Design a binder for these strands. Structure first.
Length: 61
DNA sequence: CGCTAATCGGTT
DNA sequence: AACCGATTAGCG
């Protein structure tokens, strides 16, 4: 069952994703597309990163 | 083993 | 179409 390679986010990308999450728990389609483009990530990579980050936030609360 | 990226099926 | 919760799985 082929899967995608695990993305290794740069420190710059993780820093900017965490910054975005501190500002907004969810992104609009537009804001997700803008952040993806700004970080040279796919829309899916940013969507999944935000989904998993909300899961972690739920657990740590 | 812990952290977390990616995948699956169900919910809305 | 995006999310959620459960799950699978890569790597330090």
């Amino acid at each position: 069952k082929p899967r995608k390679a695990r993305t290794a986010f740069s420190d710059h990308q993780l820093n900017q994703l965490e910054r975005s999450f501190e500002r907004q728990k969810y992104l609009s389609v537009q804001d997700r597309m803008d952040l993806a483009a700004a970080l040279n990530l796919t829309d899916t990579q940013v969507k999944t990163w935000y989904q998993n980050r909300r899961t972690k936030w739920k657990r740590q609360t």
